[PDB]
PDB file of C-alpha atoms and ligand atoms in Angstrom:
ATOM      1  CA  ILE A 994    -103.266 107.555 -23.531  1.00 17.77           C
ATOM      2  CA  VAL A 995    -104.768 109.645 -26.338  1.00 16.95           C
ATOM      3  CA  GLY A 996    -102.820 112.670 -27.592  1.00 18.02           C
ATOM      4  CA  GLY A 997     -99.764 111.958 -25.449  1.00 16.69           C
ATOM      5  CA  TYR A 998     -96.108 111.285 -26.157  1.00 14.91           C
ATOM      6  CA  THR A 999     -93.662 108.417 -25.861  1.00 10.51           C
ATOM      7  CA  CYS A1000     -92.306 108.688 -22.314  1.00  7.04           C
ATOM      8  CA  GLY A1001     -88.924 107.113 -22.962  1.00  2.67           C
ATOM      9  CA  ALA A1002     -87.744 103.831 -21.479  1.00  2.03           C
ATOM     10  CA  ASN A1003     -87.853 103.687 -17.674  1.00  2.00           C
ATOM     11  CA  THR A1004     -88.452 107.423 -17.322  1.00  2.00           C
ATOM     12  CA  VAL A1005     -91.548 106.684 -15.169  1.00  2.00           C
ATOM     13  CA  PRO A1006     -89.874 104.247 -12.792  1.00  3.14           C
ATOM     14  CA  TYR A1007     -92.895 103.753 -10.492  1.00  5.91           C
ATOM     15  CA  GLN A1008     -95.180 102.703 -13.379  1.00  5.68           C
ATOM     16  CA  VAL A1009     -96.082  99.036 -13.353  1.00  2.57           C
ATOM     17  CA  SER A1010     -98.004  96.818 -15.747  1.00  3.71           C
ATOM     18  CA  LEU A1011    -100.418  94.280 -14.269  1.00  4.90           C
ATOM     19  CA  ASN A1012    -100.279  91.113 -16.333  1.00  6.33           C
ATOM     20  CA  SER A1013    -102.561  88.059 -16.321  1.00  5.15           C
ATOM     21  CA  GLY A1014    -101.262  86.582 -19.577  1.00  7.02           C
ATOM     22  CA  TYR A1015    -101.405  90.073 -21.119  1.00  3.34           C
ATOM     23  CA  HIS A1016    -101.287  93.658 -19.877  1.00  4.11           C
ATOM     24  CA  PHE A1017    -104.662  94.697 -18.435  1.00  2.00           C
ATOM     25  CA  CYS A1018    -104.034  97.635 -16.056  1.00  2.00           C
ATOM     26  CA  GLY A1019    -101.430 100.009 -14.752  1.00  2.00           C
ATOM     27  CA  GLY A1020    -100.392 100.642 -11.179  1.00  3.81           C
ATOM     28  CA  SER A1021     -97.864 102.562  -9.092  1.00  2.00           C
ATOM     29  CA  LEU A1022     -95.068 101.155  -6.932  1.00  3.74           C
ATOM     30  CA  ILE A1023     -95.266 102.806  -3.503  1.00  6.24           C
ATOM     31  CA  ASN A1024     -92.622 100.760  -1.677  1.00  6.23           C
ATOM     32  CA  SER A1025     -90.545  97.669  -2.411  1.00  4.49           C
ATOM     33  CA  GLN A1026     -93.485  95.333  -1.659  1.00  3.41           C
ATOM     34  CA  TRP A1027     -96.648  97.247  -2.569  1.00  3.29           C
ATOM     35  CA  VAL A1028     -98.448  98.599  -5.605  1.00  2.00           C
ATOM     36  CA  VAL A1029    -101.462 100.977  -5.727  1.00  2.00           C
ATOM     37  CA  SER A1030    -103.981 100.456  -8.534  1.00  4.08           C
ATOM     38  CA  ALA A1031    -107.708 100.865  -9.209  1.00  2.43           C
ATOM     39  CA  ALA A1032    -110.233  98.565  -7.538  1.00  2.00           C
ATOM     40  CA  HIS A1033    -111.811  98.054 -10.958  1.00  2.00           C
ATOM     41  CA  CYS A1034    -108.502  96.334 -11.911  1.00  2.00           C
ATOM     42  CA  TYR A1035    -109.134  93.551  -9.378  1.00  2.00           C
ATOM     43  CA  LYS A1036    -108.740  89.961 -10.556  1.00  2.00           C
ATOM     44  CA  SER A1037    -106.860  86.909  -9.300  1.00  2.00           C
ATOM     45  CA  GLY A1038    -103.608  85.642 -10.850  1.00  2.00           C
ATOM     46  CA  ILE A1039    -101.845  88.979 -11.191  1.00  2.00           C
ATOM     47  CA  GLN A1040     -98.181  89.239 -12.082  1.00  2.00           C
ATOM     48  CA  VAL A1041     -96.722  92.671 -11.449  1.00  2.00           C
ATOM     49  CA  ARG A1042     -94.274  93.776 -14.145  1.00  2.00           C
ATOM     50  CA  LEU A1043     -91.832  96.464 -13.072  1.00  2.00           C
ATOM     51  CA  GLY A1044     -89.153  98.197 -15.136  1.00  2.00           C
ATOM     52  CA  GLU A1045     -91.215  97.932 -18.334  1.00  2.00           C
ATOM     53  CA  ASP A1046     -91.047 100.003 -21.457  1.00  2.00           C
ATOM     54  CA  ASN A1047     -92.036  97.780 -24.376  1.00  2.00           C
ATOM     55  CA  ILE A1048     -94.470  95.343 -22.745  1.00  2.00           C
ATOM     56  CA  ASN A1049     -94.041  92.867 -25.629  1.00  2.00           C
ATOM     57  CA  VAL A1050     -90.216  92.632 -25.543  1.00  2.00           C
ATOM     58  CA  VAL A1051     -87.850  91.650 -22.736  1.00  2.00           C
ATOM     59  CA  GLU A1052     -85.468  94.620 -22.814  1.00  2.00           C
ATOM     60  CA  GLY A1053     -83.419  93.859 -19.704  1.00  2.00           C
ATOM     61  CA  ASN A1054     -84.672  96.089 -16.882  1.00  2.00           C
ATOM     62  CA  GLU A1055     -87.849  94.195 -16.011  1.00  2.00           C
ATOM     63  CA  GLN A1056     -88.747  92.517 -12.752  1.00  2.00           C
ATOM     64  CA  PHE A1057     -91.673  90.095 -12.901  1.00  2.00           C
ATOM     65  CA  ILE A1058     -93.160  89.395  -9.458  1.00  2.00           C
ATOM     66  CA  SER A1059     -96.442  87.636  -8.710  1.00  2.00           C
ATOM     67  CA  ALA A1060     -98.952  89.187  -6.315  1.00  2.00           C
ATOM     68  CA  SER A1061     -99.361  87.444  -2.969  1.00  2.00           C
ATOM     69  CA  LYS A1062    -102.469  89.410  -1.962  1.00  2.00           C
ATOM     70  CA  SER A1063    -104.815  92.043  -3.297  1.00  2.00           C
ATOM     71  CA  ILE A1064    -106.845  94.321  -1.032  1.00  2.00           C
ATOM     72  CA  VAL A1065    -109.724  96.202  -2.629  1.00  2.00           C
ATOM     73  CA  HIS A1066    -110.847  99.234  -0.616  1.00  2.00           C
ATOM     74  CA  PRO A1067    -113.526  98.162   1.890  1.00  2.00           C
ATOM     75  CA  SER A1068    -115.948 100.796   0.565  1.00  2.00           C
ATOM     76  CA  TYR A1069    -115.374 100.344  -3.171  1.00  2.00           C
ATOM     77  CA  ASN A1070    -118.647 100.509  -5.097  1.00  2.00           C
ATOM     78  CA  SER A1071    -118.252  99.070  -8.602  1.00  2.00           C
ATOM     79  CA  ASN A1072    -121.423 100.765  -9.883  1.00  2.00           C
ATOM     80  CA  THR A1073    -120.448 104.333  -8.937  1.00  2.00           C
ATOM     81  CA  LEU A1074    -116.672 103.738  -8.836  1.00  2.00           C
ATOM     82  CA  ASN A1075    -116.555 105.483  -5.471  1.00  2.00           C
ATOM     83  CA  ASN A1076    -113.346 104.489  -3.635  1.00  2.00           C
ATOM     84  CA  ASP A1077    -111.752 103.039  -6.777  1.00  2.00           C
ATOM     85  CA  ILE A1078    -108.493 101.974  -5.176  1.00  2.00           C
ATOM     86  CA  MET A1079    -106.736  98.650  -4.521  1.00  2.00           C
ATOM     87  CA  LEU A1080    -103.435  97.596  -2.917  1.00  2.00           C
ATOM     88  CA  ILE A1081    -101.398  94.693  -4.280  1.00  2.00           C
ATOM     89  CA  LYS A1082     -98.632  93.041  -2.277  1.00  2.00           C
ATOM     90  CA  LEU A1083     -95.705  91.459  -4.099  1.00  2.00           C
ATOM     91  CA  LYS A1084     -94.593  87.915  -3.226  1.00  2.00           C
ATOM     92  CA  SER A1085     -91.016  89.211  -2.994  1.00  2.00           C
ATOM     93  CA  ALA A1086     -89.586  92.711  -2.684  1.00  2.00           C
ATOM     94  CA  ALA A1087     -88.655  94.567  -5.855  1.00  2.00           C
ATOM     95  CA  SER A1088     -85.027  95.559  -6.233  1.00  2.00           C
ATOM     96  CA  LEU A1089     -85.070  99.357  -6.252  1.00  2.00           C
ATOM     97  CA  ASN A1090     -82.808 101.261  -8.633  1.00  2.00           C
ATOM     98  CA  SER A1091     -83.017 104.301 -10.984  1.00  2.00           C
ATOM     99  CA  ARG A1092     -85.372 102.457 -13.343  1.00  2.00           C
ATOM    100  CA  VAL A1093     -87.544 100.800 -10.699  1.00  2.00           C
ATOM    101  CA  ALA A1094     -88.492 103.194  -7.933  1.00  2.00           C
ATOM    102  CA  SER A1095     -91.361 103.965  -5.606  1.00  2.00           C
ATOM    103  CA  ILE A1096     -93.471 107.124  -5.830  1.00  2.00           C
ATOM    104  CA  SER A1097     -94.226 109.219  -2.749  1.00  2.00           C
ATOM    105  CA  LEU A1098     -97.726 109.388  -1.333  1.00  2.00           C
ATOM    106  CA  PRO A1099     -99.171 112.892  -0.966  1.00  2.00           C
ATOM    107  CA  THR A1100     -98.947 114.852   2.287  1.00  2.00           C
ATOM    108  CA  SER A1101    -101.770 117.121   1.091  1.00  2.00           C
ATOM    109  CA  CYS A1102    -104.283 117.124  -1.757  1.00  2.00           C
ATOM    110  CA  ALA A1103    -103.334 118.854  -5.023  1.00  2.00           C
ATOM    111  CA  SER A1104    -105.333 121.862  -6.222  1.00  2.00           C
ATOM    112  CA  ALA A1105    -107.063 122.568  -9.512  1.00  2.00           C
ATOM    113  CA  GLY A1106    -104.499 123.929 -11.949  1.00  2.00           C
ATOM    114  CA  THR A1107    -101.714 121.654 -10.676  1.00  2.00           C
ATOM    115  CA  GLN A1108     -99.762 120.074 -13.517  1.00  2.00           C
ATOM    116  CA  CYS A1109     -99.513 116.295 -13.465  1.00  2.00           C
ATOM    117  CA  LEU A1110     -98.076 113.391 -15.430  1.00  2.00           C
ATOM    118  CA  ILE A1111    -100.424 110.577 -16.448  1.00  2.00           C
ATOM    119  CA  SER A1112     -99.008 107.424 -18.010  1.00  2.00           C
ATOM    120  CA  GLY A1113     -99.955 104.034 -19.366  1.00  2.00           C
ATOM    121  CA  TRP A1114    -100.186 101.453 -22.125  1.00  2.00           C
ATOM    122  CA  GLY A1115    -103.858 102.128 -22.904  1.00  2.00           C
ATOM    123  CA  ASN A1116    -105.598 102.882 -26.186  1.00  2.00           C
ATOM    124  CA  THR A1117    -104.118 105.793 -28.137  1.00  2.00           C
ATOM    125  CA  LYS A1118    -107.278 106.395 -30.244  1.00  2.00           C
ATOM    126  CA  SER A1119    -110.508 108.184 -29.239  1.00  2.00           C
ATOM    127  CA  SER A1120    -112.406 106.645 -32.154  1.00  2.00           C
ATOM    128  CA  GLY A1121    -111.072 103.219 -33.023  1.00  2.00           C
ATOM    129  CA  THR A1122    -108.424 101.146 -31.318  1.00  2.00           C
ATOM    130  CA  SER A1123    -104.638 101.050 -31.190  1.00  2.00           C
ATOM    131  CA  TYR A1124    -102.680  99.727 -28.240  1.00  2.00           C
ATOM    132  CA  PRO A1125     -99.065 100.780 -27.892  1.00  2.00           C
ATOM    133  CA  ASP A1126     -96.093  98.647 -26.971  1.00  2.00           C
ATOM    134  CA  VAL A1127     -94.124 101.374 -25.221  1.00  2.00           C
ATOM    135  CA  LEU A1128     -95.216 103.546 -22.333  1.00  2.00           C
ATOM    136  CA  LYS A1129     -97.136 106.716 -23.200  1.00  2.00           C
ATOM    137  CA  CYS A1130     -97.276 109.913 -21.182  1.00  2.00           C
ATOM    138  CA  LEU A1131     -99.533 112.949 -20.922  1.00  2.00           C
ATOM    139  CA  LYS A1132     -99.051 116.213 -19.065  1.00  2.00           C
ATOM    140  CA  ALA A1133    -102.432 117.436 -17.817  1.00  2.00           C
ATOM    141  CA  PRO A1134    -103.806 119.859 -15.238  1.00  2.00           C
ATOM    142  CA  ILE A1135    -106.227 119.055 -12.462  1.00  2.00           C
ATOM    143  CA  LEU A1136    -109.611 120.658 -13.173  1.00  2.00           C
ATOM    144  CA  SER A1137    -111.802 122.519 -10.696  1.00  2.00           C
ATOM    145  CA  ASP A1138    -114.408 120.607  -8.730  1.00  2.00           C
ATOM    146  CA  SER A1139    -117.132 122.819 -10.209  1.00  2.00           C
ATOM    147  CA  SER A1140    -116.058 122.073 -13.784  1.00  2.00           C
ATOM    148  CA  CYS A1141    -115.686 118.344 -13.034  1.00  2.00           C
ATOM    149  CA  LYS A1142    -119.216 118.277 -11.598  1.00  2.00           C
ATOM    150  CA  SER A1143    -120.547 120.319 -14.519  1.00  2.00           C
ATOM    151  CA  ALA A1144    -119.074 117.763 -16.942  1.00  2.00           C
ATOM    152  CA  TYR A1145    -120.451 114.770 -15.023  1.00  2.00           C
ATOM    153  CA  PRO A1146    -123.582 115.833 -13.115  1.00  2.00           C
ATOM    154  CA  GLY A1147    -124.500 113.438 -10.335  1.00  2.00           C
ATOM    155  CA  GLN A1148    -121.329 111.324 -10.649  1.00  2.00           C
ATOM    156  CA  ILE A1149    -118.408 113.098  -8.962  1.00  2.00           C
ATOM    157  CA  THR A1150    -117.862 112.156  -5.335  1.00  2.00           C
ATOM    158  CA  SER A1151    -115.452 113.672  -2.811  1.00  2.00           C
ATOM    159  CA  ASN A1152    -113.097 110.787  -3.705  1.00  2.00           C
ATOM    160  CA  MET A1153    -112.726 111.828  -7.354  1.00  2.00           C
ATOM    161  CA  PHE A1154    -111.162 114.608  -9.364  1.00  2.00           C
ATOM    162  CA  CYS A1155    -111.043 115.470 -13.036  1.00  2.00           C
ATOM    163  CA  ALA A1156    -107.882 116.177 -14.979  1.00  2.00           C
ATOM    164  CA  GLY A1157    -107.211 116.920 -18.607  1.00  2.00           C
ATOM    165  CA  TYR A1158    -108.625 119.175 -21.250  1.00  2.00           C
ATOM    166  CA  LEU A1159    -112.253 120.185 -21.717  1.00  2.00           C
ATOM    167  CA  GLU A1160    -111.569 120.829 -25.411  1.00  2.00           C
ATOM    168  CA  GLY A1161    -110.855 117.121 -25.916  1.00  2.00           C
ATOM    169  CA  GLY A1162    -108.015 115.416 -27.743  1.00  2.00           C
ATOM    170  CA  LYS A1163    -105.775 114.555 -24.761  1.00  2.00           C
ATOM    171  CA  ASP A1164    -106.820 112.010 -22.109  1.00  2.00           C
ATOM    172  CA  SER A1165    -106.198 108.628 -20.560  1.00  2.00           C
ATOM    173  CA  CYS A1166    -108.211 105.741 -21.993  1.00  2.00           C
ATOM    174  CA  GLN A1167    -109.063 102.017 -21.750  1.00  2.00           C
ATOM    175  CA  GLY A1168    -105.994 100.061 -20.599  1.00  2.00           C
ATOM    176  CA  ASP A1169    -104.604 103.023 -18.630  1.00  2.00           C
ATOM    177  CA  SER A1170    -106.880 101.971 -15.713  1.00  2.00           C
ATOM    178  CA  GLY A1171    -105.124 101.843 -12.379  1.00  2.00           C
ATOM    179  CA  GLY A1172    -102.132 103.889 -13.498  1.00  2.00           C
ATOM    180  CA  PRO A1173    -100.574 106.970 -11.947  1.00  2.00           C
ATOM    181  CA  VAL A1174    -101.355 110.648 -11.909  1.00  2.00           C
ATOM    182  CA  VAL A1175     -98.232 112.218 -10.408  1.00  2.00           C
ATOM    183  CA  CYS A1176     -98.006 115.897  -9.562  1.00  2.00           C
ATOM    184  CA  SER A1177     -94.888 117.549  -8.165  1.00  2.00           C
ATOM    185  CA  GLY A1178     -93.442 114.104  -7.410  1.00  2.00           C
ATOM    186  CA  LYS A1179     -96.471 112.819  -5.442  1.00  2.00           C
ATOM    187  CA  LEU A1180     -99.065 110.220  -6.417  1.00  2.00           C
ATOM    188  CA  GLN A1181    -102.284 112.257  -6.447  1.00  2.00           C
ATOM    189  CA  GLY A1182    -104.503 110.182  -8.694  1.00  2.00           C
ATOM    190  CA  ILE A1183    -105.324 106.777 -10.108  1.00  2.00           C
ATOM    191  CA  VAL A1184    -106.788 106.361 -13.600  1.00  2.00           C
ATOM    192  CA  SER A1185    -110.434 105.513 -12.874  1.00  2.00           C
ATOM    193  CA  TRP A1186    -113.070 106.397 -15.502  1.00  2.00           C
ATOM    194  CA  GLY A1187    -114.535 108.801 -18.045  1.00  2.00           C
ATOM    195  CA  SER A1188    -117.122 108.795 -20.817  1.00  2.00           C
ATOM    196  CA  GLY A1189    -115.242 107.570 -23.899  1.00  2.00           C
ATOM    197  CA  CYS A1190    -111.738 109.067 -24.170  1.00  2.00           C
ATOM    198  CA  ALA A1191    -110.541 112.527 -25.156  1.00  2.00           C
ATOM    199  CA  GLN A1192    -114.096 113.704 -25.866  1.00  2.00           C
ATOM    200  CA  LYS A1193    -115.063 117.364 -25.577  1.00  2.00           C
ATOM    201  CA  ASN A1194    -116.375 118.244 -22.090  1.00  2.00           C
ATOM    202  CA  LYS A1195    -115.712 114.685 -20.853  1.00  2.00           C
ATOM    203  CA  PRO A1196    -112.385 114.821 -19.021  1.00  2.00           C
ATOM    204  CA  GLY A1197    -110.715 111.935 -17.233  1.00  2.00           C
ATOM    205  CA  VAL A1198    -111.841 111.101 -13.716  1.00  2.00           C
ATOM    206  CA  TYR A1199    -109.279 109.960 -11.167  1.00  2.00           C
ATOM    207  CA  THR A1200    -109.328 108.480  -7.682  1.00  2.00           C
ATOM    208  CA  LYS A1201    -108.309 111.128  -5.132  1.00  2.00           C
ATOM    209  CA  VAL A1202    -105.313 109.402  -3.521  1.00  2.00           C
ATOM    210  CA  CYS A1203    -104.810 111.959  -0.750  1.00  2.00           C
ATOM    211  CA  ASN A1204    -108.064 110.719   0.853  1.00  2.00           C
ATOM    212  CA  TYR A1205    -106.584 107.220   1.210  1.00  2.00           C
ATOM    213  CA  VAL A1206    -103.150 107.826   2.704  1.00  2.00           C
ATOM    214  CA  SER A1207    -104.181 106.745   6.209  1.00  2.00           C
ATOM    215  CA  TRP A1208    -105.802 103.554   4.875  1.00  2.00           C
ATOM    216  CA  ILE A1209    -102.778 102.785   2.694  1.00  2.00           C
ATOM    217  CA  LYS A1210    -100.311 103.266   5.544  1.00  2.00           C
ATOM    218  CA  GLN A1211    -102.253 101.246   8.105  1.00  2.00           C
ATOM    219  CA  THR A1212    -102.973  98.472   5.581  1.00  2.00           C
ATOM    220  CA  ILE A1213     -99.289  98.172   4.728  1.00  2.00           C
ATOM    221  CA  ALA A1214     -98.368  98.237   8.449  1.00  2.00           C
ATOM    222  CA  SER A1215    -100.491  95.133   9.154  1.00  2.00           C
ATOM    223  CA  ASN A1216    -100.200  93.096   5.943  1.00  2.00           C
TER     224      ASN A1216
HETATM  225  C1  JLZ B2284    -111.426 102.757 -18.176  1.00  2.00           C
HETATM  226  C2  JLZ B2284    -111.255 104.233 -18.554  1.00  2.00           C
HETATM  227  C3  JLZ B2284    -112.320 104.955 -19.096  1.00  2.00           C
HETATM  228  C4  JLZ B2284    -112.153 106.302 -19.435  1.00  2.00           C
HETATM  229  C5  JLZ B2284    -110.920 106.943 -19.241  1.00  2.00           C
HETATM  230  C6  JLZ B2284    -110.775 108.404 -19.615  1.00  2.00           C
HETATM  231  N1  JLZ B2284    -111.466 108.911 -20.604  1.00  2.00           N
HETATM  232  N2  JLZ B2284    -109.953 109.092 -18.918  1.00  2.00           N
HETATM  233  C7  JLZ B2284    -109.854 106.218 -18.697  1.00  2.00           C
HETATM  234  C8  JLZ B2284    -110.027 104.877 -18.363  1.00  2.00           C
HETATM  235  F1  JLZ B2284    -109.007 104.201 -17.855  1.00  2.00           F
HETATM  236 CA1   CA B2285     -90.469  94.655 -21.623  1.00  2.00          CA
END
């Protein structure tokens, strides 16, 4: 997250870190057994880390649970990033409490102008590299479809939305991949892509979660 703020420990209780020896992606806990992330975060040997603030220090509220299965969306295209969404099932159920909690799926899609919270352990620099230990947060509005398409001609599908600031300076970034965009207490987006980070007229692009609620529910119901 570039141009954000320190969230505060366990203040984003649905935020997970995906770890394969090191943090490599975020994700969102959606029930005691399942995490939503980006398809571009797929790899084998994932350990889901819940209750994290400082990802380098065991602070006492963590739960570390290995994935039993990952399910990349059947229509994910890694070239275009269309349908950039994955489900990860935990080998055992997380213990839910104030600091480890699931986030609601949307009942309807969120409109341009809606204020959201984006979070992660990604790069905090737009030129250069600095990776934080503690969770970073950014408040950002959803942008209009027309402005999103103007920023990224030929690249925005019906399964994507832009959020952030056309002026630059505030954005998600590398390492935030797969993490949440939460608006009015609903998971509306997944950190997906963008050209660089926090660049003028190059806002963040996010997977449009509301398009996937049926798939998520029926996948969970049978897996
Ligand atoms: C992998 C990646 C690329 C760009 C952005 C962004 N500028 N929002 C975020 C990301 F997670
Ligand atoms: Ca920790």
